[PDB]
Design a protein around this nucleic acid. Structure first.
Ligand SMILES: Nc1nc2c(ncn2[C@@H]2O[C@H](COP(=O)(O)OP(=O)(O)OP(=O)(O)O)[C@@H](O)[C@H]2O)c(=O)[nH]1
Ligand SMILES: Nc1ncnc2c1ncn2[C@H]1C[C@H](O)[C@@H](COP(=O)(O)NP(=O)(O)OP(=O)(O)O)O1
Ligand SMILES: Nc1ncnc2c1ncn2[C@H]1C[C@H](O)[C@@H](COP(=O)(O)NP(=O)(O)OP(=O)(O)O)O1
Ligand SMILES: [Co+2]
Ligand SMILES: [Co+2]
Ligand SMILES: [Co+2]
Ligand SMILES: [Co+2]
Length: 219
DNA sequence: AAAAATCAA
């Protein structure tokens, strides 16, 4: 059924480090020293565990990348927090417009607490430094807003024998708040049929993205 | 049976 296809599809899209992943608890994350499995993903989808994925494979390539638009911590508790909610969507729309201009297919996710991820998926892994560079240059094009932080995963160009950074992946439960992390549309409205959205997500071409790095870098 | 908690920039 569609939900079973979603299990296999999730594993292909959020494919990072081969042999380590992460789970969220209340106050941190913890590495799990083995490959992610189907049972891990069923536990993600049901709320029994919350998965985070290390983006960098052992050869310092990534199969996906993400912007992380956040409300700054000290803006969170304000009574006019709705302003910085708007601002976070303003910054996300600007980034997305640039990404569309570069024909980079991407998807929005409400992260279950204080912001949004913009997910970028690749059919074949690409060098972590190349996508990171593209994402940094695109950020350098847009106006920012007060109280918003934009973060770029991958955070590393290379592991140097380490794990790198991980990102909490969608369709799970945010352990800081108990709310589902869900895909949203271009207007930030929650998609009703998440499973089907997941099964329609498209991968960018590594060949195109590789060409785009040389192009932006202008050699 | 449940409490405890990693790893990075
Ligand atoms: N790897 C790792 N990254 C972190 C950790 N804490 C924060 N970050 C990252 O740093 C960014 C800034 O978040 P902050 O809210 O300022 O994090 P903090 O200063 O440690 O305080 P809290 O997250 O509220 O506990 C986050 O979006 C995360 O990407 C951590 O303990 N380990
Ligand atoms: N203590 C920690 N240890 C290891 N990795 C962590 C971490 N904290 C975060 N990360 C990783 C996983 C995280 O996904 C990412 C930074 O995300 P955040 O901005 O802190 N939280 P998110 O974007 O997921 O949702 P929202 O912002 O609404 O709270 O770095
Ligand atoms: N004076 C005003 N006039 C019209 N709409 C207003 C408004 N004040 C607030 N709105 C609201 C009601 C409108 O339905 C909503 C639309 O604003 P976006 O969705 O941010 N931008 P757009 O839809 O034009 O396209 P894209 O997202 O691709 O950029 O703003
Ligand atoms: Co911290
Ligand atoms: Co962040
Ligand atoms: Co965030
Ligand atoms: Co709109």
């Amino acid at each position: 059924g569609p939900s079973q296809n979603a299990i296999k599809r999730f594993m292909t899209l959020f494919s990072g480090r081969e042999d380590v992943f992460s789970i969220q608890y209340e106050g941190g994350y913890r590495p799990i020293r083995r490959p992610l499995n189907f049972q891990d993903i069923k536990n993600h989808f049901s709320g029994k565990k919350t998965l985070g994925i290390y983006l960098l494979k052992k050869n310092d390539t990534v199969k996906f990348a993400a912007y992380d638009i956040d409300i700054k911590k000290h803006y969170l508790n304000r009574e006019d927090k709705f302003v910085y909610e708007e601002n976070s969507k303003k910054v996300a729309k600007r980034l997305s417009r640039e990404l569309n201009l570069e024909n980079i297919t991407h998807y929005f996710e409400f992260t279950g607490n204080r912001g949004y991820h913009i997910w970028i998926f690749f059919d074949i892994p690409v060098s972590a430094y190349k996508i990171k560079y593209i994402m940094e240059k695109i950020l350098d094009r847009i106006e920012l807003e007060e109280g918003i932080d934009v973060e770029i995963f991958p955070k590393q160009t290379s592991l140097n024998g380490g794990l790198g950074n991980l990102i909490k992946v969608p369709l799970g439960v945010h352990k800081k708040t108990g709310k589902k992390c869900l895909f949203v549309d271009n207007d930030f409205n929650v998609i009703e049929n998440q499973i089907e959205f997941l099964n329609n997500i498209k991968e960018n071409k590594a060949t195109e993205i590789n060409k785009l790095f040389r192009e932006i870098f202008n050699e």
